[PDB]
Scaffold this motif. Structure first.
Motif, short mmCIF file in Angstrom:
data_model
loop_
_atom_site.label_atom_id
_atom_site.label_comp_id
_atom_site.label_asym_id
_atom_site.label_seq_id
_atom_site.Cartn_x
_atom_site.Cartn_y
_atom_site.Cartn_z
N UNK A 19 22.01 90.85 -0.21
CA UNK A 19 22.41 89.40 0.13
C UNK A 19 21.74 88.17 -0.45
N UNK A 20 20.45 88.50 -0.68
CA UNK A 20 19.76 87.55 -1.71
C UNK A 20 20.48 87.88 -3.25
N UNK A 21 20.20 87.05 -4.15
CA UNK A 21 20.69 87.01 -5.21
C UNK A 21 21.96 86.48 -5.51
N UNK A 22 23.04 86.58 -4.52
CA UNK A 22 24.14 85.89 -4.72
C UNK A 22 24.19 84.67 -4.28
N UNK A 23 23.15 84.24 -3.53
CA UNK A 23 22.94 82.77 -3.19
C UNK A 23 21.56 82.39 -3.86
N UNK A 24 21.42 82.75 -5.38
CA UNK A 24 20.55 81.90 -6.32
C UNK A 24 21.44 81.15 -7.22
N UNK A 66 25.03 95.28 -0.28
CA UNK A 66 24.60 95.51 -1.45
C UNK A 66 25.54 96.06 -2.45
N UNK A 67 26.31 94.72 -2.85
CA UNK A 67 27.45 95.22 -3.93
C UNK A 67 26.85 95.00 -5.38
N UNK A 68 27.81 95.52 -6.30
CA UNK A 68 27.27 95.68 -7.62
C UNK A 68 27.44 94.41 -8.38
N UNK A 69 27.82 93.28 -7.73
CA UNK A 69 28.12 91.88 -8.30
C UNK A 69 26.71 91.08 -7.95
N UNK A 70 25.85 91.65 -7.24
CA UNK A 70 24.79 90.97 -6.57
C UNK A 70 23.78 90.70 -7.80
N UNK A 71 23.53 91.49 -8.82
CA UNK A 71 22.54 91.41 -9.88
C UNK A 71 22.96 91.63 -11.17
N UNK A 72 22.26 91.74 -12.00
CA UNK A 72 22.56 92.03 -13.48
C UNK A 72 22.60 93.83 -13.54
N UNK A 73 21.61 94.32 -12.98
CA UNK A 73 21.68 95.79 -13.07
C UNK A 73 21.06 96.11 -11.56
N UNK A 74 21.68 97.06 -11.12
CA UNK A 74 21.25 97.60 -9.72
C UNK A 74 21.43 99.02 -9.62
N UNK A 75 20.34 99.95 -9.45
CA UNK A 75 19.96 101.34 -9.15
C UNK A 75 19.89 101.53 -7.79
N UNK A 76 20.59 102.41 -7.18
CA UNK A 76 20.22 103.02 -5.70
C UNK A 76 20.07 104.59 -5.52
N UNK A 77 19.20 105.03 -4.70
CA UNK A 77 19.10 106.28 -4.30
C UNK A 77 19.50 106.69 -3.16
N UNK A 78 19.92 107.77 -2.71
CA UNK A 78 20.80 108.38 -1.73
C UNK A 78 20.28 109.54 -0.96
N UNK A 79 19.02 109.61 -0.77
CA UNK A 79 18.42 110.79 -0.15
C UNK A 79 18.81 111.56 0.92
N UNK A 80 19.47 110.56 1.88
CA UNK A 80 19.73 111.21 3.27
C UNK A 80 21.09 110.97 3.81
N UNK A 81 22.12 111.22 2.88
CA UNK A 81 23.41 111.01 3.18
C UNK A 81 24.14 111.85 3.95
#
Lengths: 417, 213, 204
Positions: A135-140, A166-181
């Motif tokens: 939610x940060x980054x979109x308001x920069x 956390x959307x993929x348009x929030x930054x220039x490059x976003x990586x996400x881990x998914x350990x406990x789904x």
């Protein structure tokens, strides 16, 4: 505009990692030169997730030391939460839309007074911290460089809007881990939806092979897999692109061409894509979290057409540096005139393969079991494709001992070509 | 007939049960262990074949009744890992009903048995593919004598343990009736609840059913 | 090019024959002058054959004393195998093509840094050691002087190629003993084929 910043800030040194001595204040400019903010290097912002006690968790005074060992002469800013996070969970699920605005105001202040580039900012995020950084980054004023999310929050943020999580348009490059789904759709602790440009599912993402400390076991692997990637600079842990969890177990998707097979953690390559990008790897239950990946294709041949099921095999690996001896695997629905493939992993370095045993063990133990002549097959070739070093060797035997039989001596294959 | 729940002495473990089930049948004269006729191993787990009419439900061991047949006669029972090898057999049929059509799978339940003589408290069982407007049946066994049933709890436990898990409002159903058919004494009781607390919900308080008729 | 040398090396003294104190390291040159390698005399390299336990056999601490009694002020280098030989036999039948390359790299290092003559090198070999010394020498910069093979391996090395076994082109002079050649063709413990320049059959 600088008194609604109750979410405080702090800057820590390599000589003092467990305290909060020198604060930063948005608006007061006598403190920026007091904390010795080096205006040339990159800047890490570590956002704290949920808690239930009053203090910080146990991974932050290790992540500070890991960042100051990997990237010396840099900036690690610790955001504070301890008057807003010690709540119930739908209470703390609404404060992210305020803390992200506070961080956005701080970053716009730093980018509009000191003329900071906003090109060397990492935004590290825990379960609520990843959605706070989202939610940060979109308001920069412009795009931030990289946001790394470590197992984001699941319940109230799934099924939401794109300007809410956390959307993929929030930054220039976003990586996400998914350990406990693990769980039902909409009732999971981690988020089941792929949200980043790169989305890594270690061990598929259901659980981790190590499971009050035991309660949150597989929720701290998304930090212990990142501290290991910061420490092991020279040795990266590759992750492999496939299409489903069931297909990766068959090993049909160890292909490292055309923007596939990226790394995991800090050393990832900036590659954008068009859709969601599910990627896979396996791990180990201890502090070195790297395992190798081998593909084995076996050609069955014979005369007597007899199908079987749930047969257990044992295989060995003989190479230049070291050896692996008793790796177990199983294969259901074995029959003549087929070609079967699977996935195989180990934790001992090999080098280049030389020879390979193959033993088909017996479930029975009785002294009766030596009779009633055992089923057997005629194995010709084994195709082996290694994971990292893309070598496709061919193994075969001589024109003797080419008859694998259950509860007998194993065959021994050599380098065939 | 695959194995026995007790597995050089350990090597021949499930080959001496065919003698230790016969010595027990010789010792326990007054208490026979009934065995039940079904058609396949998978159908006996669903409990659809607890029927003791027309030359079915013979005994096991020395006290068997001399009944000839026309074909092969497969018969089934369960046992226990100790020297009294008798367990009872109960059939439970559950009617699911509700409004929100949502299928689930691999849900774990816990049930109790409250009777005249003694009680059984925390018997576990699971059911895959639970959904609304269905009628499910299974098999249930125990090792404590009951007599005649009076009441029966029913609890649907939660797999999650976190402090998060109290929210995201849990799935629930509206259970009307449970048909219970005992094994030996062929009694078909009917259980129901009052017009309150008739809403089983996961991770909540269990419902309590009484003798309905 | 000097970290794939896991087959170690050692140098032993007449005053200490049963231990492995002073090692040699290919590439590190502060250790060659540490073990007092006399650059004037000849050099014996004793290659160990197959084993099944973890330690060496019983004939090596006698052969060391015999070499140091017959040729005093010389060099006897003991090659190590104890992480590669304690296997099954078709497993250890493939490691000779690697250990011979390691010995060839060591000898080319000694012949290209210290300008060693390669004219006074004996290569003693046991059953797998003779084929190890045979796959060595062919991968050197020039011909080694003498390779002595003591009852080489039979099963998987018979019927093979000439660049795969102890062939008579591997050195300048090769002598081979054949003590235990009883059995069928292709199923014998020692090798039944004459392979050396001189092939001695004691008691047939």
């Amino acid at each position: 505009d600088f008194r609604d910043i109750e979410s405080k800030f702090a800057l820590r040194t390599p000589e003092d990692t467990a305290e909060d001595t020198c604060h930063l204040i948005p608006g007061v400019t006598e403190s920026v030169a007091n904390c010795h903010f080096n205006h040339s290097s990159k800047t890490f912002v570590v956002i704290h997730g949920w808690t239930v006690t009053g203090m910080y968790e146990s991974w932050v005074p290790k992540l500070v030391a890991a960042l100051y060992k990997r990237e010396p002469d840099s900036n690690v800013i610790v955001v504070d939460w301890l008057s807003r996070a010690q709540q119930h969970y739908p209470v703390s699920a609404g404060y992210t839309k305020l803390v992200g605005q506070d961080v956005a105001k701080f970053m716009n202040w730093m980018a509009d007074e000191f003329n900071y580039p906003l090109g060397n900012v990492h935004l590290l995020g825990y379960s609520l911290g990843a959605h706070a950084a989202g939610i940060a980054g979109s308001l920069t004023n412009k795009k931030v460089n990289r946001i790394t999310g470590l197992d984001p929050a699941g319940p109230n943020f799934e099924y939401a809007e794109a300007p809410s999580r956390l959307s993929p348009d929030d930054a220039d490059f976003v990586d996400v881990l998914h350990t406990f789904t693990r769980g039902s759709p909409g009732r999971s602790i981690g988020i089941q939806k792929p949200v980043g440009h790169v989305d890594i599912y270690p061990n598929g993402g259901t659980f981790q092979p190590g499971c009050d400390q035991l309660v949150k076991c597989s929720h701290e692997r998304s930090v212990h897999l990142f501290i290991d990637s910061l420490l092991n600079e020279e040795n990266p842990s590759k992750a492999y692109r496939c299409n489903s969890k069931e297909a990766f177990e068959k090993g049909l998707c160890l292909s490292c061409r055309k923007n596939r097979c990226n790394n995991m953690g800090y050393e990832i390559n900036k590659v954008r894509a068009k859709r969601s990008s599910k990627m896979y790897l396996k791990t180990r239950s201890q502090m070195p979290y790297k395992v190798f990946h081998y593909q084995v294709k076996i050609h069955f041949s014979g005369t007597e057409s007899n199908t079987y099921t749930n047969q257990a095999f044992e295989i060995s690996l003989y190479g230049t540096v070291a050896e692996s001896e008793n790796i177990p695997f199983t294969l259901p629905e074995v029959s003549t005139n087929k070609t079967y493939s699977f996935l195989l992993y180990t934790e001992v370095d090999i080098g280049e393969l030389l020879m390979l045993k193959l033993k088909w063990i017996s479930d029975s133990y009785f002294s009766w079991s030596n009779w009633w002549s055992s089923p057997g097959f005629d194995i010709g070739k084994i195709r082996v494709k290694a994971g990292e070093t893309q070598k496709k060797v061919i193994f075969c035997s001589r024109e003797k001992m080419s008859y694998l039989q259950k509860g007998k001596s194993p065959v021994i294959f050599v380098k065939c070509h």
